[PDB]
Design a protein around this ligand. Structure first.
Ligand code: HEM
Ligand code: HEM
Ligand SMILES: *[C@@H]1O[C@H](CO)[C@@H](O)[C@H](O)[C@H]1NC(C)=O
Ligand SMILES: *[C@@H]1O[C@H](CO)[C@@H](O)[C@H](O)[C@H]1NC(C)=O
Lengths: 260, 141, 242, 141
């Protein structure tokens, strides 16, 4: 049992830090909500972009199907077809960029959710473990208020608050665990303490990953926004190109019919 | 916003209330007056004693209005337009009071229809009364 | 200087009407705030002038720091653009709790954008909040919002469809924002507050909108904001002239 | 402040509460009715549906703790401030919980009591419990 003022103070500090784990982590976890909101906003914006560029995409598809027919007729080398293809190559390049950047945004969105789910699970495990370990320490602290053991040990136990004065950290929790290694009664739970600290680190690191991933996602989204506008702006000229190449293709069809 | 699922919950809970609506309205007012005495200031000329006939009369009008809103959940602003001008402009009832009466109505329903007052129904009714409260206060200035 | 918060919404101000109704205003430089024309007209006749209004207002910033007002300037087309400017008698002292938000050069009122709206409006119990709160909201599709309140984007097909029984002012000068992930919305007294967007490249906060329609209260689905880019020139001219 | 008569009606009622259940049911309902409160409790696992919420063991367990603190408040109606000073320090200073949520939980608890006690949850007993929930909310703030 805890019989000295020193043992009581080491136990007190540890119990506070173990109990603080869930509190600190809930606060830290709640900072990831902005990133979940942002990544959901990226997805909505991508769906809106995909809709806005669909007419430009439809024109580019019409161009490829007219070109495929020209290849079948052996007329794909027609100078007008060649010229049209050159004129639309920026749009083809922009469409490939739009596809690539949107995919990068969507992967970052998946990673944000995955890191957030690991942060949540880490928080939940840390709380389960932390609260239980703090309860075992409190058995000793509460017993230390009565019976044998110095009057100073009892007074210190009576003064002990459930809660830490500030947020915990890997450093502070570790410091508390290490100080308690000297205390007989607490020493039986050393492996429990270690698992709490590993869950704290894991949750915290996952929160860091959410933030970094979200930043990368945002950079990709800025490129998506830029290239989506270039495609929408090209819509009218792309529709014109699709009609011209269809005319070229139609003239070659009628030249083949008339030549048979 | 009331979802279709909320609307179903409200129509069912209020269908169980049925003919008791006036009695429940009178009890919600009685609970409001007693729990939150400041509300009594809007009714300076009422007999607000337990069992007052004037309160039973008013409870019936309040209930009829809610019944009407339940019947017209998709068009509540329209169904409550006269009442909304009445409360916001003429009477100038501070919005806080609507949350007091809403709480007291929920308490009344919980006490009288325990079988129906599930968590989902409680969420739906709170949302329904919040829509009524908002409609009745949106013109307040 | 602007848009670098250390406490989280140092640009937020609290306006109190002569009949003790709390509303919002937003600090845009050391001596001027944006708010709405509706806020300014609380407890006034529809025929009041800026001169009638100004001496009847009480304004605070930071930790209950009362600031004295010199004058008010109503937007010349305030029935379309629900805005007013407030000029203080003197510059505020900038610190960790009091700092203007930047006015934007870019138009951040696009779907895919998330904003933070702080406010002194009424809470879930319809009481004016004791503590400043905020909501994180996404910019919503303009057409979705128009259909929600007006039924159609086509003028001849419009009908008053507002779920709260009062219609917002919706036009080319405004944007809408949704509701939070946890279905939190804005409500009475939140108007005048900024829809603040964080530009991650510059690491600066910008006022993208000023909340106009603060009556949605999670009953109607969208808050309606005046686009700051659409009034920027008028703001600059007004400040330069007064 | 509670008349001794009110203190009496309150403890009389409380003595009959299922200490193992009404805590989880009030917390469970707060999370369903006012979903933004979940952000403090996402660590409880599955809260995706009202049944998931109401049947969740962590909600039940945590509920017991909340109810236990209300029980302590009942034993010290004269000094709620001192009784709740440590808890206020946690919720206020560490957690930054908007004090309006304490009033919402208190009100949900009143609804739960009404739900379980029916008619016995009379208007005067409600009014006494409203003093308790306000007192507990102010002390936590
Ligand atoms: C769900 C909320 C409410 C509903 C449905 C409701 C409904 C109405 C109805 C139907 C009337 C009667 C109109 C008539 O005289 O023909 C009215 C009158 C009135 N209401 Fe409300 N009301 C509500 C909330 C409020 C609240 C919260 C208060 C104040 C605390 C308020 C105070 C009054 C007063 C003072 C009158 C006028 C009394 C009279 O002269 O008859 N009510 N109520
Ligand atoms: C008004 C009545 C309330 C009572 C009596 C109450 C009671 C308490 C008690 C006794 C604990 C401490 C358990 C412990 O860790 O040793 C606590 C913890 C907590 N409460 Fe409350 N509470 C109330 C309202 C609130 C509300 C409204 C919220 C937020 C929505 C809140 C969120 C929390 C959180 C997050 C914890 C910390 C759990 C942890 O991580 O350690 N509760 N509750
Ligand atoms: C409300 O406004 C009036 C003055 O019009 C006055 O009673 C007081 O200044 C305000 N009330 C409170 C409680 O501050
Ligand atoms: C006010 O409205 C008219 C409408 O045609 C417009 O020409 C004018 O520029 C507007 N003023 C400002 C400052 O926006």
């Amino acid at each position: 049992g805890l019989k000295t003022k020193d043992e009581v103070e080491k136990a007190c500090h540890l119990a506070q830090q173990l109990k603080e784990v869930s509190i600190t982590l809930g606060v830290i976890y709640r900072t990831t909500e902005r990133h979940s909101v942002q990544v959901e906003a990226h997805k909505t914006a991508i769906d809106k972009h995909a809709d806005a560029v669909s007419r430009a995409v439809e024109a580019l598809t019409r161009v490829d199907v007219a070109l495929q027919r020209l290849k079948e007729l052996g007329k794909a080398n027609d100078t007008k077809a060649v010229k049209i293809i050159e004129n639309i190559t920026s749009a083809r390049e922009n469409l490939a960029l739009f596809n690539n950047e949107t995919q990068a945004v969507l992967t970052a969105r998946d990673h944000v959710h995955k890191h957030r789910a690991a942060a949540l699970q880490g928080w939940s495990d840390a709380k389960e473990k932390g609260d239980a370990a703090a309860e075992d320490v409190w058995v000793l602290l509460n017993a230390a208020k009565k019976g044998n053991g110095s009057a100073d040990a009892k007074a210190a136990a009576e003064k002990c608050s459930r809660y830490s004065s500030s947020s915990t950290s890997e450093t502070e929790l570790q410091k508390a665990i290490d100080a308690a290694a000297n205390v007989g009664g607490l020493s039986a739970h050393k492996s429990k303490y270690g698992d709490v600290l590993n869950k704290f680190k894991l949750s915290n690191a996952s929160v860091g990953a959410v933030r970094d991933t979200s930043g990368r996602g945002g950079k990709h989204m800025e490129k998506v926004n830029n290239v989506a506008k270039l495609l929408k702006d090209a819509e009218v000229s792309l529709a014109a190109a699709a009609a011209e190449i269809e005319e070229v293709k139609n003239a070659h069809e009628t030249k083949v019919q008339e030549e048979m | 916003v009331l979802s279709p699922a909320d609307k179903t919950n409200v129509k069912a809970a209020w269908g169980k209330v049925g003919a008791h609506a006036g009695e429940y309205g009178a009890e919600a007012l009685e609970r409001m007056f007693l729990s939150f005495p400041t509300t009594k200031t809007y009714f300076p000329h009422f007999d607000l004693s337990h069992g007052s006939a004037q309160v039973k009369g008013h409870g019936k009008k309040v209930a009829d209005a809610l019944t009407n809103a339940v019947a017209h959940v998709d068009d509540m602003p329209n169904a409550l337009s006269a009442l909304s001008d009445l409360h916001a402009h003429k009477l100038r009832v501070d919005p806080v009071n609507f949350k007091l009466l809403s709480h007291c109505l929920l308490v009344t329903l919980a006490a009288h229809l325990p079988a129906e007052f599930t968590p989902a129904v409680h969420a739906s009714l709170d949302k329904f009364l919040a829509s009524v409260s908002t409609v009745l206060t949106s013109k307040y200035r | 200087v602007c848009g670098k918060p250390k406490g989280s919404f140092p640009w937020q101000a609290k306006m109190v009407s002569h009949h003790n109704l709390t509303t919002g205003a937003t600090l845009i430089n050391e001596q001027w705030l944006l708010t709405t024309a509706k806020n300014l007209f609380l407890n006034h006749s529809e025929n009041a002038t800026a001169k009638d209004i100004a001496p009847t207002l009480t304004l605070y910033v930071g930790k209950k720091q009362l600031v004295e007002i010199e004058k008010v300037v109503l937007h010349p087309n305030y029935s379309q653009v629900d805005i007013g400017l407030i000029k203080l008698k003197q510059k505020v002292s900038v610190n960790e709790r009091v700092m203007p938000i930047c006015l934007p050069s870019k138009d951040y009122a696009e779907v895919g954008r998330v904003g933070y709206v702080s406010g002194w409006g009424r809470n879930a119990n319809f009481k004016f909040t004791d503590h400043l709160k905020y909501v994180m909201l996404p910019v919503a599709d303009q057409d979705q919002c128009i259909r929600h309140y007006e039924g159609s984007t086509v003028p001849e097909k419009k009908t008053p469809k507002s779920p709260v029984g009062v219609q917002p002012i919706l036009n080319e000068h405004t944007f809408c924002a949704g509701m939070s992930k946890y279905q939190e919305d804005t409500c009475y007294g939140d108007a005048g507050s900024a829809f603040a967007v964080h530009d991650l490249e510059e690491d600066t906060w910008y006022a993208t909108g000023i909340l106009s329609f603060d009556k949605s209260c999670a009953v109607a689905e969208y808050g309606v904001y005046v686009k700051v880019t659409s009034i920027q020139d008028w703001v600059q001219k007004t400040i330069a002239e007064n | 402040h509670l008349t001794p008569e009110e203190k009496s009606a309150v403890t009389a009622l409380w003595g009959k509460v299922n200490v193992d259940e009404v805590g989880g049911e009030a917390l469970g309902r707060l999370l369903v009715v006012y979903p933004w409160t979940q952000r403090f409790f996402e660590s409880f696992g599955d809260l995706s549906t009202p049944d998931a919420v109401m049947g969740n063991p962590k909600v039940k367990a945590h509920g017991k703790k909340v109810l236990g603190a209300f029980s302590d408040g009942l034993a010290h109606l004269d000094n709620l401030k001192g009784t709740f000073a440590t808890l206020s320090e946690l919720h206020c200073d560490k957690l930054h919980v908007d004090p309006e949520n304490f009033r919402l939980l208190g009100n949900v608890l009143v609804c739960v009591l009404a739900h379980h006690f029916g008619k016995e949850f009379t208007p005067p007993v409600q009014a006494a419990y409203q003093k308790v929930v306000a007192g507990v909310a102010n002390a936590l703030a």
